[model samples]
Target: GHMVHEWSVQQVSHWLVGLSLDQYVSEFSAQNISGEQLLQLDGNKLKALGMTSSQDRALVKKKLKEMKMSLEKA
Candidate 1:
């Protein structure tokens, strides 16, 4: 088979941290960035940050919720 088609919060949180760090440094500054403003950073930062789309951060949250059961099994 292949990797599971889901991700736990721990997994998503780790990924988000890595993604956010890249966004914080390369895309913009490490200032008080938050909210929708993070999304409007830059394409370069997005790519470098491993962001697949404009809403990947939210998607991570949604997926993490969806995979909670999967996490229990994991």
Candidate 2:
């Protein structure tokens, strides 16, 4: 696990890259979104971060929710 709550913004940014959404990482890194922020992301917040595609937003949102569940399992 990524230890979501403790991750710095850079870790959050790199995670976006892992999602193969490299386009968003630039803004995400510059925006300084921590893993805590990432864990809470929704469509609105993702749009605010310049994630334009609705499909991608949904994918990211889904992934975040999965991580949320994983965290809860601990």
Candidate 3:
């Protein structure tokens, strides 16, 4: 799954950035169980998972951090 995030001065468009073939393979290989697998998950789960060592989760956090964001909802 992919999504576009913007900090725009104008209108923002959501777009999915294409993945390279190798990135697709790597991401597929790195997939993990969804948070819903164990229990009902909410913002805390998202934040906790964001700090987890799992490569996929950490990547999510990294991308958000790159955009100056937090997992906490406003």
Cα lDDT, all candidates: 0.39, 0.73, 0.28
**Better by lDDT, candidate 3 or 2:** 2
- Top TM-score model: 2
Give the local distance difference test score of model 3: 0.28
Position 39, candidate 3: lDDT: 22
For candidate 3, what's the RMSD?
11.4
Q: Ten-residue segment with the worst summed lDDT in candidate 3?
A: 9-18
lDDT of 3 by residue, 1-74 (tens): 12123222111111001111122222222333222221232335444434333553445334434332221221
Question: Sorted by lDDT, highest first, which candidate order results?
Answer: 2, 1, 3
| Predicted structure 1: lDDT | 0.39
Question: In candidate 1, which residue pairs get closer than 3 Å at backbone N, Cα or C atoms, i.e. clash?
Answer: none
- The TM-score, computed over Cα atoms with residue i paired to residue i, of candidate 2 is 0.78
Residue-wise C-alpha lDDT for candidate 2, range 1-74, written one tens digit per residue: 46777777677655666567677778877887877788888878888877678777877777777876654443
Backbone clashes in model 2, listed as residue pairs: none
RMSD per model, one decimal: 10.8, 3.3, 11.4
Ranking by TM-score: 2, 3, 1
- Sum up the clashes in candidate 2: 0
Off by over 4 Å in 2: 68-74
